[PDB]
């Protein structure tokens, strides 16, 4: 029933032998155990990034953490299981996820019956992330277009955290 | 090669041990300074976890539901693995977890299993557990489970196709009881098999021409409030359905 | 910003003060996807070739 072929260097392609390897892909009721290689992108830390670590995602700034963990653990969690830390899958460092900065935009308006001089306060953000030439950092947010004075005065146009604006010559 | 180890005494299992405490870590999470409420397959605090003793061996087949608790007080090192499966015979596919120096060998196949498994005892042999195998689904090597007088605790859970094993080995001064205080088990392996397990039994070894006690239980869906520190370690716990 | 204030308030005359006209959102500049160390320790390579 089983016989050899007279395969020779002088036969044409239809008869010439070939070494054939066959790839066949199966799905059964089991956890998957095989896939191809994966490719990571380069890690950037102190910038807003749309991150994906082992399938877990979010947007933020990722920098070195002062947290400790068991060799076992991979992710840190905040309220309602929001990820607040990851360990890198390749680099054995714990990285703290700072949510990417957000806040409202508060516009400091003179009476329009006086002038068109307007400054803008960006809430919950540093003047590293927003700027312009007249850029000052307040406790409330990043203030651009206004100047700062060391003296105290009464309060006409509130910024927050003890800081309040007004108009002077 | 397979031999009959059976004591042939009824040896009613004892329930003189309460299982005061013991959980496993539910996920890979860096939690700290938090009491986190988790609903998972935890063993109840203060439960009817059975006390068994071998050597004249005591290694009966006990049911496996969603998961199983196992512990031992060995110094004598007579335990070398566990067998799990739907029938533990040649009718269905089954899983053998066997420990030896430096590692554990894990195999899942349709095996022809003997009536009372044991290990050959220098040289070692698993032909006292199974006579043959074919139609294999899974093979795995990593790190030993029975790592080495500590209480050796393990939890075996079988969900979503994975056989999840957690463990801890904590020093003891006890012979027939458990140490008191809170402790949580860490994952040893997350094993991707696709196996249906309904019952299991212990693999013992002794030169055939010391002895050991075992504590075996089962786990239930329960809610626990778990206390985590600034290390990711669970340091304490409350069983929300006990009292 | 002066015009933004007039629009948020539905007025072409505005009294001295602070009004919220828009929201501030820092945008992501990059995309980072990370996977564990990948090594081809696989019997697949004993068949192909
Ligand atoms: C994943 O693979 C990377 C390679 O891209 C591994 O990083 C490599 O780790 C080794 C061991 O630490 C490094 O060798 C030594 O590193 C130290 C400090 O980096 C250096 O002082 C020694 O001279 C020596 O080179 C190697 O440099 C490092 N490579 C890079 C690019 O960082 C990484 O360990 C692997 N991760 C896992 C989880 O296996
Ligand atoms: C203990 O078991 C390990 C693996 O769990 C044994 O490793 C064997 O290694 C040889 C050669 O490297 C392989 O051919 C075998 O397939 C492995 N055996 C098994 C059962 O996987 C190791 O030899 C065993 N003994 C010791 C003393 O470590
Ligand atoms: C959690 O980790 C902290 C930080 O390393 C440990 O605190 C250290 O404890 C050692 C000895 O126990 C001291 O030498 C260090 O001075 C401590 N470091 C700090 C920053 O306090 C602590 O032991 C760990 N806790 C647990 C329960 O593992
Ligand atoms: C941002 O401003 C805050 C003021 O609360 C300051 O503490 C912090 O150092 C600033 N960060 C940067 C990066 O300038
Ligand atoms: C305000 O104080 C800062 C910091 O001491 C100083 O550099 C600056 O000259 C002061 N400005 C005025 C107007 O006094
Ligand atoms: C289970 O433990 C309880 C402790 O409340 C005990 O009363 C009982 O005897 C044990 N069960 C059996 C079947 O022995
Ligand atoms: C062989 O194992 C595979 C994977 O579990 C299964 O699909 C198949 O039904 C098994 N065959 C027999 C005869 O057990
Ligand atoms: C396990 O048994 C159940 C019976 O409900 C069956 O539906 C399922 O296919 C089995 N799973 C595996 C992985 O064999």
Written account of the structure:
Chain B: Glycans are attached at residues 4, 48, 100, 135, 196, 231. This is part of a larger assembly, with three copies of chain A. Chain A is an all-beta fold. Chain A has no helices and eleven strands. In chain A, the strands form three sheets. Chain A has a five-stranded antiparallel beta sheet, with no helix packed on it. Chain A has a four-stranded antiparallel beta sheet with strand order 6-7-9-8, with no helix packed on it. In chain A, strands 10-11 form a two-stranded antiparallel ribbon. Chains in contact: A-B, A-C. Chain A binds chain B through residues 28-33, 67-70, 72-77, 85, 94, and chain B through 25, 28-32, 137, 160-162, 186-187, 192-194, 230-233. The site of one 2-acetamido-2-deoxy-beta-D-glucopyranose (NAG) has 3 residues of chain A, from loops.
Order of helices and strands of chain A: EEEEEEEEEEE
Q: What small ligands are held by the chains?
A: a molecule of 3 linked components (NAG-NAG-BMA), a molecule of 2 linked components (NAG-NAG), 2-acetamido-2-deoxy-beta-D-glucopyranose
What is the overall shape of chain A?
Answer: elongated
Beta fraction of the residues of chain A? 25-35%
Question: How much is the radius of gyration of chain A in Å?
Answer: 31 Å
Going by helix content, strand content and strand pairing, the class of chain A is mainly beta
Helix content of chain A: under 10%
Main sheet characteristics of chain A: 5 strands, antiparallel
Biggest interface pair, residues each? A-C, 55 and 37 residues
What's the end-to-end separation of chain A, in Å? 109 Å
Glycosylation sites (chain A): 113, 126, 150, 169
Region (Disordered) (chain A): 29-51
Protein name (chain A): Spike protein S1
Disulfide bonds (chain A): 48-100, 127-142, 155-164
């Amino acid at each position: 029933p089983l016989q050899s072929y007279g395969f020779q260097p002088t036969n044409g392609v239809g008869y010439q032998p070939y070494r054939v390897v066959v790839l066949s892909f199966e799905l059964l009721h089991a956890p998957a155990t095989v896939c191809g290689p994966k490719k990571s992108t380069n890690l950037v830390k102190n910038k807003c990034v749309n991150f994906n670590f082992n399938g877990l995602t979010g947007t933020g700034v990722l920098t070195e953490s002062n947290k400790k963990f068991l060799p076992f653990q991979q992710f840190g969690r905040d309220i309602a299981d929001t990820t607040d830390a990851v360990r890198d899958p390749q680099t054995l460092e714990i990285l703290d996820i700072t949510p990417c900065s957000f806040g409202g935009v508060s516009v400091i308006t003179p009476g329009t019956n006086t002038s068109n001089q307007v400054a803008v306060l960006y809430q919950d953000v540093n003047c590293t992330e927003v700027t312009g030439s007249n850029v000052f950092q307040t406790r409330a947010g990043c203030l651009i277009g206004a100047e700062h004075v060391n003296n105290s005065y009464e309060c006409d146009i509130p910024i927050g955290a003890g800081i309040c604006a007004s108009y002077q010559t | 090669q397979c031999v009959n180890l059976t004591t042939r005494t009824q040896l009613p299992p004892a329930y003189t041990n309460s299982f005061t405490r013991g959980v496993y870590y539910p996920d890979k999470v860096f939690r700290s300074s938090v009491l986190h409420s988790t609903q998972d397959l935890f063993l109840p605090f203060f439960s009817n976890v059975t006390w068994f003793h071998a050597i004249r061996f005591d290694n009966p087949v006990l049911p496996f539901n969603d998961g199983v608790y196992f512990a031992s007080t060995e110094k004598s090192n007579i335990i070398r693995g566990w067998i799990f499966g739907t029938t533990l015979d040649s009718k269905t596919q089954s899983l053998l977890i066997v420990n030896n120096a430096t590692n554990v060998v894990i195999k899942v196949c349709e095996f022809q299993f003997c009536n009372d498994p044991f290990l050959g005892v220098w040289m070692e042999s698993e032909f006292r557990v199974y006579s043959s195998a074919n139609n294999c689904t899974f093979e795995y090597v990593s790190q030993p489970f029975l790592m080495d007088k500590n209480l050796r605790e393990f939890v075996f859970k079988n969900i979503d196709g994975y056989f999840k094993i957690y463990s801890k080995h904590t020093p003891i001064n006890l012979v027939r009881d458990l140490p008191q205080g809170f402790s949580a088990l860490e994952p040893l392996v997350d094993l991707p098999i696709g196996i249906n397990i309904t019952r299991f039994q212990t693999l013992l070894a002794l030169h055939r021409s010391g002895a050991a006690a075992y504590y075996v239980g089962y786990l239930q869906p329960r809610t626990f409030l778990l206390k985590y520190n600034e290390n990711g370690t669970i340091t304490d716990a409350v069983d929300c359905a006990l009292d | 910003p002066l015009s933004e204030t007039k629009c948020t308030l539905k007025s072409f005359t505005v009294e001295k003060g602070i009004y919220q006209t828009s929201n501030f959102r820092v945008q992501p500049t990059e995309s980072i996807v990370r996977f564990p160390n990948i090594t081809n320790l696989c019997p697949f390579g004993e068949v192909f070739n």
